[PDB]
Structures are given as C-alpha cells and as structure tokens.
Amino acid sequence: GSHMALALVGEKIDRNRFTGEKIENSTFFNCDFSGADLSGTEFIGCQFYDRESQKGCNFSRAMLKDAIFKSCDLSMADFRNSSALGIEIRHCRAQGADFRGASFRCSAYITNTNLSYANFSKVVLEKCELWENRWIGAQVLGATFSGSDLSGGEFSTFDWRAANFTHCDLTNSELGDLDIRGVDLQGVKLDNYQASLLMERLGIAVI
Amino acid sequence: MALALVGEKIDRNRFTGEKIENSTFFNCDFSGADLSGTEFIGCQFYDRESQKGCNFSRAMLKDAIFKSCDLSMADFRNSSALGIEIRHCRAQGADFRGASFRNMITTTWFCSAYITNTNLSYANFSKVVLEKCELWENRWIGAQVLGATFSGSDLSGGEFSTFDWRAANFTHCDLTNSELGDLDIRGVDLQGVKLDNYQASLLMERLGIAVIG
C-alpha cells in the first residue's frame, strides 16, 4: 500500500494529491496531472495510456523533481515544460512521449525504456544516464545529450546529425546509419566492433 | 665478383643474365643496358664521395634482381622493369618516373614487381603504375607519388610518415602493420583497403573517438 490498484479516468489531478507518495499497479486514463506537484512521487507498474482512445496523460508543467516511474506505460505522455531534475524513468514504455521544453537542470535517469517516436527536440540532457533505451524514430533536433551514457541503445531510424553527441558513451549499441564523415563524435566512446562497423561504411576492411 | 667500375658506360650485353656480387659501380651509365635475368647482390651503385648515382634510364630490367644493394639516387626513368625484384635495398631518391612494370598478356594488363624491405625515402614514383605488386616492409618517407597507382598492391609493414595519401591510388591495398603518418579516413579514398585493429583505433583517435576494449 497504501495506494494500490487505483483506477482513475478523465480526472484533473489535484496538485498535492500524490506528492511524495508511492503508487502501485494503478491505471490513469486520460488524466490531467498538469501543474501537479509530483516531487519524490513514485509510480510502479502503472498504466498512463488508454489503447481505446489512444490518449496519454498530461504532465505538462508538473513538478517532477526526483519523481520515479518504474515499469510504467507512459505512451503518448505529455511531459512538456515540466521540471524534471533527477527524474527516473526505468523499464518503462514511453513511445511517443513528449519532453519538449522539460528541464532536467543536468540530472536524469531514463534507462531500459522504449523511447520510440518520443520527442526530445531542443532538450538539454548533458552528462545524464540514458542507457539501454530504444530510440527508433525519436526526434532529437537541436537537443544535446553531450557527455551522457547512451550505451546499450538501439538507434536505427535515428538521425545522428540532429543533436549534440560529443563526449557520449555509445558503446555496445546498435548505431544504425552513423556516418563518421558527417557527425561530430569528439570525445565519444565506441567499442572495437562499432569502430570496424563505421569504417566498413567507408569501404575499409578491418582485420 | 669484387668489380670496381668508375665512370664507365656499360655495354648493352656486358652483364645480361649474369650474377654480380660485392661490386661497386660509381657514376656508371647503364643507360639502355640489357639487364634481364641479371642479379646484383651486395653491390653499391652510389658514390658517397661524389654524391652521385648510376643511370639506368631506358634499361631493360625484366626479371632483374637487386639484393642488399645501394641504389641511392639511381635513375630508373623510362626503364622496362616487368617482374623486377628489389629486396633489402637502399633506394633513397631513386627515380622511377616512366618506368614500366607491366605488359599486355593473352588470356589484359599484367603488372608485376617485388620491392620489399627497401628504403624508398624521397624516391619518385610520379605517375608510375604498380598494381597488385608486392611492395611490403618499405620506408616511404617523402616519396613522391602524385598520379601513381598502387591499387591492389601489398604495402603492409610500411613507414608512411611524411607521405601524401591524397596523391595516389591506394584502393584495394593491404596497408596493415604500417605507420600511417597523417592518413585521415575522412579525406582519402580507402575502398577495399585492409587495415588492422591497432591502425583503426589510431585513425579513430584522429576523429577524437576513443575505441575500447
């Protein structure tokens, strides 16, 4: 407990309703958490997406300092303009989630998470933990991930030219179509399989 | 054996097909000489006093062999050197422009040369065609290669500091176990090229990339 198996539908969430609480195995369909204070709040095994209406929940402008989502379905979630310093998103589905304007000032832990088609445009995520994610079709234009750990990632259908990746750890990942002739990889960590992969693209055989 | 010629013009058939050892040839003129199947071993062709070399321009060098010779400043211009063997030689500043290492054969151009363990510093290979040849363990400091093609040749074990990688065709070359100087993979056509793991990590550093591990 003491907040297990809630089932909300279409509600506007009171600002202090969940602050610093732990919430488990609950469903929130089309709920409006905008401006909500979710500091130190922890959701575990919760569903925030309605496959019926195809609606996510609204978290825009929410206070999310030290919030934690663990094994949650955050598909289509709207995290725009939220304050998310130290947020943890672990083992979640976050397909189509929208992080534009969210601030992480950096500290953030988004790991083992499906970020396919998520929107990170202009976002600043420097020296953060962003490992073992799925990034297929994620929008990252103007973003910076500089210095972050992105290792273990899946990056097909992902535009490596669109954001700042200098100083990133990219090891043990599926790089997809990264061309070292047109991408600034100063300070980046790669492994030897990846180095060979990127050189093969130039027609070189590494032996 | 132990010949010691100075300033001579060499008769065309003087040395054809013969084995010459531990001899010196200072300021001699082998121009147009027939040196097919001729083998020189431990011979000096460079006069360290007069600082002059020998002239082999337009010589017939098909299947000639030079081993442990000093061919410094040697002039090989416009010679015919199909299948030539130059091994463990000093050849600093030798001039190979217009030299031919090839001929048309019946089943196509067949190119063939063995230049190995040889100092080619400052040698001139401008426009030379040396494709699919054995060219390994050579020193190439300051060699001029503009317009040359080495395509498909084995250049492994080479020293390519101070060497213009943009000047010549290196596609399909074996470049492994070599000091690559300022080779940069972003600016040179390296299709079909073989490099080893150590070189790859070095070349990646040039891009600021760390390769583990």
Q: Which long-range contacts (CB under 8 A, 24 or more apart) does A147-154 make?
A: A147/A187, A151/A189
Residues of chain B in contact with residue A191, where contact means CB-CB under 8 angstroms, are 211-213
A to B CB pairs, distance under 8 Å: 72
Report helix, strand or coil for A129. strand
**Checking DSSP bridges between strand B84-87 and strand B46-47, what pairing results, if any?**
unpaired
Q: How far apart are the C-alpha atoms of A172 and B34, rounded to whole Å?
A: 62
Q: How far apart are the C-alpha atoms of A13 and B148, rounded to whole Å?
A: 75
Asked if A185 and B207 count as a contact pair (C-beta separation under 8 A), the reply is: yes
Count the Cβ atoms, other than its own, within 10 Å of residue B182.
Answer: 14
Nearest to B209 by CA among A155, A142, A197, A133: A197
CA of A122 vs chain B CAs: smallest distance (Å): 25
Q: How far apart are the C-alpha atoms of B86 and B68, rounded to whole Å?
A: 8
Q: Does B185 touch chain A (CB under 8 A)?
A: yes
Asked if B16 and B34 count as a contact pair (C-beta separation under 8 A), the reply is: yes
Determine the straight-line distance between the first and last CA of chain B, rounded to whole angstroms: 56
CB burial of A60-84 (b: ≥16 within 10 Å; e: otherwise) equals bbbbbbbbbbbbbbbbbbbbbbbbb
CA angle, A173 then A176 then A177, to 5°: 135
CA angle, B128 then B130 then B133, to 5°: 160
Asked if B211's CB is within 8 angstroms of A203's CB, the reply is no
Q: A153: which residues sit within 8 A by CB, 6+ positions away?
A: A130, A131, A132, A133, A134, A135, A170, A173, A174
Nearest to B201 by CA among A189, A135, A83: A189
Exposure on the CB side of residue B156, measured as CA atoms within 13 A = 13
Q: How far apart are the C-alpha atoms of B120 and B141, rounded to whole Å?
A: 7
Method used for this model? X-ray
**The total number of structural domains that make up chain A:** 1
Residues 148-177 of B with CB under 8 A from A: 176
Q: Does A199 touch chain B (CB under 8 A)?
A: yes
Q: How far apart are the C-alpha atoms of B22 and B68, rounded to whole Å?
A: 10
CA angle, B202 then B130 then B154, to 5°: 40
CA A144 to chain centre: 13
CA of A124 vs chain B CAs: smallest distance (Å): 22
Determine the straight-line distance between the first and last CA of chain A, rounded to whole angstroms: 58
Determine whether A8 is exposed, middle or buried from the number of CB atoms within 10 Å of its CB (0-12, 13-18, 19+). middle
Lookup: tokens for B91: 């050849």
Q: Does A10 touch chain B (CB under 8 A)?
A: no
Whole-number Cα distances in Å, A111 to A47, A114, A200, B155: 18, 9, 30, 47
CA angle, A127 then A62 then A58, to 5°: 110
Q: What residue has token string 């954001």?
A: A163
- From B185, B208, B213, residue closest to A204, measured CB to CB: B185
Q: Does A187 touch chain B (CB under 8 A)?
A: yes
Give the amino acid at A202: L
What is the CATH classification number for the domain harbouring A137?
A: 2.160.20.80
Q: How far apart are the C-alpha atoms of A159 and A177, rounded to whole Å?
A: 8
Provide the residue range defining the domain that includes A68. Answer: 1-207
Tell me the structure's resolution in angstroms, rounded to a single decimal: 2.2
Q: How far apart are the C-alpha atoms of A126 and A108, rounded to whole Å?
A: 9
Whole-number Cα distances in Å, B83 to A14, B63, B101, B114: 89, 5, 7, 7
Report helix, strand or coil for B46. strand
Q: Does A195 touch chain B (CB under 8 A)?
A: yes
Q: How far apart are the C-alpha atoms of B101 and A75, rounded to whole Å?
A: 68
Asked if B207's CB is within 8 angstroms of A190's CB, the reply is no
Q: Does A188 touch chain B (CB under 8 A)?
A: yes
CA of A40 vs chain B CAs: smallest distance (Å): 37
Q: Does B188 touch chain A (CB under 8 A)?
A: no
Determine whether B90 is exposed, middle or buried from the number of CB atoms within 10 Å of its CB (0-12, 13-18, 19+). buried
Q: B1: which residues sit within 8 A by CB, 6+ positions away?
A: B20, B21, B22, B23
Asked if A186 and A206 count as a contact pair (C-beta separation under 8 A), the reply is: no
Q: Does A44 touch chain B (CB under 8 A)?
A: no
Q: What residue has token string 């919430």?
A: A23
Residues of chain B in contact with residue A192, where contact means CB-CB under 8 angstroms, are 197, 200-201, 211-213
CB burial of A154-182 (b: ≥16 within 10 Å; e: otherwise) equals bbeebbbebbbbebbbbbbbebeebebee
Q: A139: which residues sit within 8 A by CB, 6+ positions away?
A: A117, A118, A119, A120, A121, A162
Name the DSSP letter for residue A175: -
Whole-number Cα distances in Å, B108 to A85, A173, A205, B104, B113: 70, 46, 27, 5, 17
Q: How far apart are the C-alpha atoms of B12 and B34, rounded to whole Å?
A: 5
